[PDB]
Amino acid sequence: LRQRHTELEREVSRFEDQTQQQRQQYAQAKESLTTLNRLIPQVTLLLDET
Amino acid sequence: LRQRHTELEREVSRFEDQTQQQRQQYAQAKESLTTLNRLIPQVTLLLDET
Amino acid sequence: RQGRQYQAEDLEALQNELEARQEALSLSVNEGGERRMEMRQELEQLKQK
Amino acid sequence: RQGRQYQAEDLEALQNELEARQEALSLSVNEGGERRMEMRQELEQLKQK
C-alpha cells in the first residue's frame, strides 16, 4: 500500500502537470482567438484585400 | 448511507439544474456577443448611418 | 433578443460587459459540474460501502 | 504574437480551430479534475487501509 501511495503521488504529479500545461496553453489560445474575433472578426473581409 | 444517497441525489438534481440554466443563459449571451462582433463588430461605422 | 432597445445606437460598452458574463460562464460551470461530479464519485463510494 | 506570419490572408479556419481547441480546453480540464479527485478518494481509502 505504501508503494501504491508512492505511485499515486506520481500520478497526482502527472495529472497536475497535464492540467497546468493544457489549461495555460489553451487559455493563451483563448486570448488569441478573442483578439482575432474582436479586432478582425472578418474585418479583413471588410478590408477584402481590395 | 442510503439517507446520504437521498441527500446526494437532491444535491445532484440542484447542481444539474443550476448548471443547465446558467450555461444556457450564459451561452445565449455569448452568442449575442458573437452576433454583435460578427454582424456589427463596429461595422456600424461602415454603415455610419449615412 | 437580449435587451429590448438597450442603447443599440452605440452599444460598444455592452460587449465588454458580456466579456465579464462570458468569464462568469466558465467559472459558473467549471465549479458546478465538478461539484456534482464530486458527489458522483462519493455516491459511487457510498454505494460500494 | 501568435504565429509569425500565419495565413492572415484568410484566417477564419484558424478561428474555427481555436474554437475546437477551447472545446478541448473544457474536455481536458474536466477529465483531469475528475480523474485526479477520484484517485484522491482512492488515496484516502488506501490511507484508511
PDB file of C-alpha atoms in Angstrom:
ATOM      1  CA  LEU A   1       0.000   0.000   0.000  1.00  0.00           C
ATOM      2  CA  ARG A   2       2.916   2.383   0.560  1.00  0.00           C
ATOM      3  CA  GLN A   3       4.166   1.526  -2.928  1.00  0.00           C
ATOM      4  CA  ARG A   4       0.636   2.212  -4.159  1.00  0.00           C
ATOM      5  CA  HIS A   5       0.714   5.565  -2.354  1.00  0.00           C
ATOM      6  CA  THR A   6       4.034   6.441  -3.982  1.00  0.00           C
ATOM      7  CA  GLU A   7       2.682   5.575  -7.425  1.00  0.00           C
ATOM      8  CA  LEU A   8      -0.489   7.527  -6.643  1.00  0.00           C
ATOM      9  CA  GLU A   9       1.575  10.600  -5.777  1.00  0.00           C
ATOM     10  CA  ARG A  10       3.426  10.150  -9.063  1.00  0.00           C
ATOM     11  CA  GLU A  11       0.041  10.035 -10.799  1.00  0.00           C
ATOM     12  CA  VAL A  12      -1.086  13.184  -8.965  1.00  0.00           C
ATOM     13  CA  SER A  13       2.025  14.930 -10.239  1.00  0.00           C
ATOM     14  CA  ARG A  14       1.352  13.709 -13.781  1.00  0.00           C
ATOM     15  CA  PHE A  15      -2.271  14.877 -13.688  1.00  0.00           C
ATOM     16  CA  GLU A  16      -1.284  18.268 -12.290  1.00  0.00           C
ATOM     17  CA  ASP A  17       1.383  18.744 -14.961  1.00  0.00           C
ATOM     18  CA  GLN A  18      -1.042  17.814 -17.734  1.00  0.00           C
ATOM     19  CA  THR A  19      -3.805  20.028 -16.344  1.00  0.00           C
ATOM     20  CA  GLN A  20      -1.496  23.009 -15.914  1.00  0.00           C
ATOM     21  CA  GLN A  21       0.079  22.744 -19.352  1.00  0.00           C
ATOM     22  CA  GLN A  22      -3.234  22.276 -21.157  1.00  0.00           C
ATOM     23  CA  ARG A  23      -5.092  24.973 -19.214  1.00  0.00           C
ATOM     24  CA  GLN A  24      -2.392  27.597 -19.698  1.00  0.00           C
ATOM     25  CA  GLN A  25      -1.791  26.824 -23.382  1.00  0.00           C
ATOM     26  CA  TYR A  26      -5.484  26.808 -24.235  1.00  0.00           C
ATOM     27  CA  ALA A  27      -6.048  29.969 -22.168  1.00  0.00           C
ATOM     28  CA  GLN A  28      -3.483  31.785 -24.302  1.00  0.00           C
ATOM     29  CA  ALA A  29      -5.248  30.291 -27.320  1.00  0.00           C
ATOM     30  CA  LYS A  30      -8.460  31.761 -25.888  1.00  0.00           C
ATOM     31  CA  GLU A  31      -6.803  35.172 -25.657  1.00  0.00           C
ATOM     32  CA  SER A  32      -5.545  34.955 -29.243  1.00  0.00           C
ATOM     33  CA  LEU A  33      -8.971  33.904 -30.524  1.00  0.00           C
ATOM     34  CA  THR A  34     -10.591  36.762 -28.615  1.00  0.00           C
ATOM     35  CA  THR A  35      -8.147  39.223 -30.170  1.00  0.00           C
ATOM     36  CA  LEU A  36      -8.918  37.862 -33.635  1.00  0.00           C
ATOM     37  CA  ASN A  37     -12.700  37.854 -33.203  1.00  0.00           C
ATOM     38  CA  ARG A  38     -12.584  41.346 -31.650  1.00  0.00           C
ATOM     39  CA  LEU A  39     -10.139  43.308 -33.807  1.00  0.00           C
ATOM     40  CA  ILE A  40     -10.649  41.316 -37.018  1.00  0.00           C
ATOM     41  CA  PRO A  41     -13.811  39.186 -36.934  1.00  0.00           C
ATOM     42  CA  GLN A  42     -13.812  39.274 -40.739  1.00  0.00           C
ATOM     43  CA  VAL A  43     -12.802  42.924 -40.599  1.00  0.00           C
ATOM     44  CA  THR A  44     -10.272  41.525 -43.055  1.00  0.00           C
ATOM     45  CA  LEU A  45     -13.245  40.834 -45.335  1.00  0.00           C
ATOM     46  CA  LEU A  46     -14.291  44.459 -44.883  1.00  0.00           C
ATOM     47  CA  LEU A  47     -10.730  45.207 -45.963  1.00  0.00           C
ATOM     48  CA  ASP A  48     -11.257  42.429 -48.540  1.00  0.00           C
ATOM     49  CA  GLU A  49      -7.633  42.921 -49.633  1.00  0.00           C
ATOM     50  CA  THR A  50      -9.310  45.318 -52.042  1.00  0.00           C
TER      51      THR A  50
ATOM     52  CA  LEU B   1     -25.643   5.864   3.849  1.00  0.00           C
ATOM     53  CA  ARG B   2     -28.933   5.492   1.964  1.00  0.00           C
ATOM     54  CA  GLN B   3     -30.156   8.715   3.562  1.00  0.00           C
ATOM     55  CA  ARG B   4     -26.839  10.187   2.439  1.00  0.00           C
ATOM     56  CA  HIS B   5     -27.708   8.853  -1.020  1.00  0.00           C
ATOM     57  CA  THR B   6     -31.032  10.688  -0.886  1.00  0.00           C
ATOM     58  CA  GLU B   7     -29.315  13.943   0.079  1.00  0.00           C
ATOM     59  CA  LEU B   8     -26.696  13.358  -2.619  1.00  0.00           C
ATOM     60  CA  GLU B   9     -29.439  12.891  -5.207  1.00  0.00           C
ATOM     61  CA  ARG B  10     -31.038  16.132  -4.021  1.00  0.00           C
ATOM     62  CA  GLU B  11     -27.719  17.953  -4.391  1.00  0.00           C
ATOM     63  CA  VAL B  12     -27.092  16.366  -7.791  1.00  0.00           C
ATOM     64  CA  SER B  13     -30.507  17.477  -9.033  1.00  0.00           C
ATOM     65  CA  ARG B  14     -29.952  21.008  -7.734  1.00  0.00           C
ATOM     66  CA  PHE B  15     -26.492  21.364  -9.278  1.00  0.00           C
ATOM     67  CA  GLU B  16     -27.550  19.724 -12.546  1.00  0.00           C
ATOM     68  CA  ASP B  17     -30.445  22.158 -12.897  1.00  0.00           C
ATOM     69  CA  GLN B  18     -28.462  25.242 -11.879  1.00  0.00           C
ATOM     70  CA  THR B  19     -25.650  24.344 -14.276  1.00  0.00           C
ATOM     71  CA  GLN B  20     -28.111  23.697 -17.107  1.00  0.00           C
ATOM     72  CA  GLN B  21     -29.835  27.056 -16.694  1.00  0.00           C
ATOM     73  CA  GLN B  22     -26.698  29.103 -16.051  1.00  0.00           C
ATOM     74  CA  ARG B  23     -24.906  27.556 -19.023  1.00  0.00           C
ATOM     75  CA  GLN B  24     -27.938  28.137 -21.254  1.00  0.00           C
ATOM     76  CA  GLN B  25     -28.271  31.826 -20.372  1.00  0.00           C
ATOM     77  CA  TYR B  26     -24.525  32.485 -20.456  1.00  0.00           C
ATOM     78  CA  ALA B  27     -24.161  30.661 -23.782  1.00  0.00           C
ATOM     79  CA  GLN B  28     -27.041  32.704 -25.195  1.00  0.00           C
ATOM     80  CA  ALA B  29     -25.346  35.902 -24.009  1.00  0.00           C
ATOM     81  CA  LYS B  30     -22.098  34.630 -25.546  1.00  0.00           C
ATOM     82  CA  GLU B  31     -23.915  34.005 -28.830  1.00  0.00           C
ATOM     83  CA  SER B  32     -25.322  37.524 -28.534  1.00  0.00           C
ATOM     84  CA  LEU B  33     -21.775  38.856 -28.188  1.00  0.00           C
ATOM     85  CA  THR B  34     -20.701  36.820 -31.214  1.00  0.00           C
ATOM     86  CA  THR B  35     -23.640  38.145 -33.236  1.00  0.00           C
ATOM     87  CA  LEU B  36     -22.637  41.670 -32.223  1.00  0.00           C
ATOM     88  CA  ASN B  37     -18.954  41.304 -33.135  1.00  0.00           C
ATOM     89  CA  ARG B  38     -19.847  39.347 -36.310  1.00  0.00           C
ATOM     90  CA  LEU B  39     -22.755  41.306 -37.791  1.00  0.00           C
ATOM     91  CA  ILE B  40     -21.717  44.605 -36.179  1.00  0.00           C
ATOM     92  CA  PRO B  41     -18.084  44.494 -35.000  1.00  0.00           C
ATOM     93  CA  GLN B  42     -18.151  48.279 -35.384  1.00  0.00           C
ATOM     94  CA  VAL B  43     -19.490  47.515 -38.861  1.00  0.00           C
ATOM     95  CA  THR B  44     -21.959  50.234 -37.891  1.00  0.00           C
ATOM     96  CA  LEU B  45     -19.038  52.571 -38.623  1.00  0.00           C
ATOM     97  CA  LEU B  46     -19.039  51.420 -42.247  1.00  0.00           C
ATOM     98  CA  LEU B  47     -22.822  51.699 -42.156  1.00  0.00           C
ATOM     99  CA  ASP B  48     -22.197  55.055 -40.452  1.00  0.00           C
ATOM    100  CA  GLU B  49     -25.961  55.716 -40.554  1.00  0.00           C
ATOM    101  CA  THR B  50     -25.208  57.901 -43.570  1.00  0.00           C
TER     102      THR B  50
ATOM    103  CA  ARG C   1     -33.367  39.284 -28.378  1.00  0.00           C
ATOM    104  CA  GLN C   2     -31.370  40.495 -25.380  1.00  0.00           C
ATOM    105  CA  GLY C   3     -32.164  43.952 -24.208  1.00  0.00           C
ATOM    106  CA  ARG C   4     -35.238  45.422 -25.902  1.00  0.00           C
ATOM    107  CA  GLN C   5     -33.751  48.509 -27.493  1.00  0.00           C
ATOM    108  CA  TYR C   6     -30.918  48.672 -24.972  1.00  0.00           C
ATOM    109  CA  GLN C   7     -28.893  51.582 -26.356  1.00  0.00           C
ATOM    110  CA  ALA C   8     -28.286  49.896 -29.714  1.00  0.00           C
ATOM    111  CA  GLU C   9     -27.460  53.361 -31.088  1.00  0.00           C
ATOM    112  CA  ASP C  10     -23.972  52.983 -29.603  1.00  0.00           C
ATOM    113  CA  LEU C  11     -23.666  49.581 -27.948  1.00  0.00           C
ATOM    114  CA  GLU C  12     -19.872  49.258 -27.636  1.00  0.00           C
ATOM    115  CA  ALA C  13     -19.710  49.093 -23.840  1.00  0.00           C
ATOM    116  CA  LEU C  14     -22.203  46.225 -23.639  1.00  0.00           C
ATOM    117  CA  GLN C  15     -19.792  43.927 -25.470  1.00  0.00           C
ATOM    118  CA  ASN C  16     -17.217  44.428 -22.725  1.00  0.00           C
ATOM    119  CA  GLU C  17     -19.959  43.739 -20.190  1.00  0.00           C
ATOM    120  CA  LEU C  18     -20.666  40.473 -21.992  1.00  0.00           C
ATOM    121  CA  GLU C  19     -16.990  39.571 -21.664  1.00  0.00           C
ATOM    122  CA  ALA C  20     -17.397  39.582 -17.891  1.00  0.00           C
ATOM    123  CA  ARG C  21     -20.519  37.467 -18.352  1.00  0.00           C
ATOM    124  CA  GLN C  22     -18.526  35.152 -20.604  1.00  0.00           C
ATOM    125  CA  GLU C  23     -15.907  34.800 -17.885  1.00  0.00           C
ATOM    126  CA  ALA C  24     -18.560  34.087 -15.261  1.00  0.00           C
ATOM    127  CA  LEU C  25     -19.784  31.377 -17.628  1.00  0.00           C
ATOM    128  CA  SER C  26     -16.672  29.225 -17.335  1.00  0.00           C
ATOM    129  CA  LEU C  27     -16.383  29.720 -13.586  1.00  0.00           C
ATOM    130  CA  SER C  28     -20.103  29.179 -13.070  1.00  0.00           C
ATOM    131  CA  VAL C  29     -19.897  25.901 -14.981  1.00  0.00           C
ATOM    132  CA  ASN C  30     -16.410  24.726 -14.022  1.00  0.00           C
ATOM    133  CA  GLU C  31     -17.414  24.758 -10.363  1.00  0.00           C
ATOM    134  CA  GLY C  32     -20.930  23.411 -10.843  1.00  0.00           C
ATOM    135  CA  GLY C  33     -20.143  20.267 -12.789  1.00  0.00           C
ATOM    136  CA  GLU C  34     -17.180  19.491 -10.561  1.00  0.00           C
ATOM    137  CA  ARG C  35     -19.421  19.647  -7.501  1.00  0.00           C
ATOM    138  CA  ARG C  36     -21.937  17.187  -8.923  1.00  0.00           C
ATOM    139  CA  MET C  37     -19.030  15.215 -10.357  1.00  0.00           C
ATOM    140  CA  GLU C  38     -17.517  15.208  -6.878  1.00  0.00           C
ATOM    141  CA  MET C  39     -20.634  13.720  -5.320  1.00  0.00           C
ATOM    142  CA  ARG C  40     -20.846  11.246  -8.205  1.00  0.00           C
ATOM    143  CA  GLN C  41     -17.608   9.668  -7.022  1.00  0.00           C
ATOM    144  CA  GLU C  42     -18.765   9.923  -3.418  1.00  0.00           C
ATOM    145  CA  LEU C  43     -22.121   8.472  -4.425  1.00  0.00           C
ATOM    146  CA  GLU C  44     -20.348   5.535  -6.034  1.00  0.00           C
ATOM    147  CA  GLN C  45     -18.213   5.183  -2.920  1.00  0.00           C
ATOM    148  CA  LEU C  46     -21.312   5.299  -0.743  1.00  0.00           C
ATOM    149  CA  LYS C  47     -22.982   2.683  -2.928  1.00  0.00           C
ATOM    150  CA  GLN C  48     -19.910   0.470  -2.721  1.00  0.00           C
ATOM    151  CA  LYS C  49     -19.826   0.865   1.047  1.00  0.00           C
TER     152      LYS C  49
ATOM    153  CA  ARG D   1       2.064  37.485 -31.384  1.00  0.00           C
ATOM    154  CA  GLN D   2       0.672  34.073 -32.358  1.00  0.00           C
ATOM    155  CA  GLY D   3       2.334  32.565 -35.374  1.00  0.00           C
ATOM    156  CA  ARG D   4       4.843  34.834 -37.117  1.00  0.00           C
ATOM    157  CA  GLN D   5       3.103  35.233 -40.446  1.00  0.00           C
ATOM    158  CA  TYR D   6       0.122  32.980 -40.127  1.00  0.00           C
ATOM    159  CA  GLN D   7      -2.324  32.868 -43.065  1.00  0.00           C
ATOM    160  CA  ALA D   8      -3.573  36.390 -42.351  1.00  0.00           C
ATOM    161  CA  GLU D   9      -4.844  36.364 -45.943  1.00  0.00           C
ATOM    162  CA  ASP D  10      -7.651  34.004 -44.890  1.00  0.00           C
ATOM    163  CA  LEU D  11      -7.681  33.195 -41.180  1.00  0.00           C
ATOM    164  CA  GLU D  12     -11.266  32.040 -40.478  1.00  0.00           C
ATOM    165  CA  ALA D  13     -10.165  28.398 -40.408  1.00  0.00           C
ATOM    166  CA  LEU D  14      -7.799  29.295 -37.577  1.00  0.00           C
ATOM    167  CA  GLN D  15     -10.582  30.868 -35.522  1.00  0.00           C
ATOM    168  CA  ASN D  16     -12.598  27.689 -36.045  1.00  0.00           C
ATOM    169  CA  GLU D  17      -9.651  25.521 -34.981  1.00  0.00           C
ATOM    170  CA  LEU D  18      -9.144  27.640 -31.864  1.00  0.00           C
ATOM    171  CA  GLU D  19     -12.829  27.219 -31.012  1.00  0.00           C
ATOM    172  CA  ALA D  20     -12.259  23.473 -31.301  1.00  0.00           C
ATOM    173  CA  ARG D  21      -9.205  23.812 -29.061  1.00  0.00           C
ATOM    174  CA  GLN D  22     -11.331  25.650 -26.485  1.00  0.00           C
ATOM    175  CA  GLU D  23     -13.759  22.742 -26.551  1.00  0.00           C
ATOM    176  CA  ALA D  24     -10.627  20.673 -25.922  1.00  0.00           C
ATOM    177  CA  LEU D  25      -9.820  23.006 -23.016  1.00  0.00           C
ATOM    178  CA  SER D  26     -13.144  22.225 -21.385  1.00  0.00           C
ATOM    179  CA  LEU D  27     -12.956  18.486 -22.048  1.00  0.00           C
ATOM    180  CA  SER D  28      -9.363  18.103 -20.867  1.00  0.00           C
ATOM    181  CA  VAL D  29      -9.762  20.210 -17.727  1.00  0.00           C
ATOM    182  CA  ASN D  30     -12.929  18.385 -16.667  1.00  0.00           C
ATOM    183  CA  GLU D  31     -11.386  14.975 -17.364  1.00  0.00           C
ATOM    184  CA  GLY D  32      -8.208  15.781 -15.460  1.00  0.00           C
ATOM    185  CA  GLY D  33     -10.130  17.131 -12.491  1.00  0.00           C
ATOM    186  CA  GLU D  34     -12.478  14.167 -12.243  1.00  0.00           C
ATOM    187  CA  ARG D  35      -9.689  11.612 -12.631  1.00  0.00           C
ATOM    188  CA  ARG D  36      -7.415  13.282 -10.096  1.00  0.00           C
ATOM    189  CA  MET D  37     -10.148  13.653  -7.486  1.00  0.00           C
ATOM    190  CA  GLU D  38     -11.342  10.059  -7.941  1.00  0.00           C
ATOM    191  CA  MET D  39      -7.783   8.850  -7.446  1.00  0.00           C
ATOM    192  CA  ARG D  40      -7.525  11.188  -4.436  1.00  0.00           C
ATOM    193  CA  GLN D  41     -10.513   9.337  -2.983  1.00  0.00           C
ATOM    194  CA  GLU D  42      -8.664   6.110  -3.762  1.00  0.00           C
ATOM    195  CA  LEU D  43      -5.700   7.604  -1.892  1.00  0.00           C
ATOM    196  CA  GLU D  44      -7.961   8.271   1.086  1.00  0.00           C
ATOM    197  CA  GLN D  45      -9.216   4.682   1.018  1.00  0.00           C
ATOM    198  CA  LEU D  46      -5.640   3.400   0.878  1.00  0.00           C
ATOM    199  CA  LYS D  47      -4.733   5.694   3.771  1.00  0.00           C
ATOM    200  CA  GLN D  48      -7.510   4.302   5.950  1.00  0.00           C
ATOM    201  CA  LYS D  49      -6.482   0.781   4.974  1.00  0.00           C
TER     202      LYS D  49
END
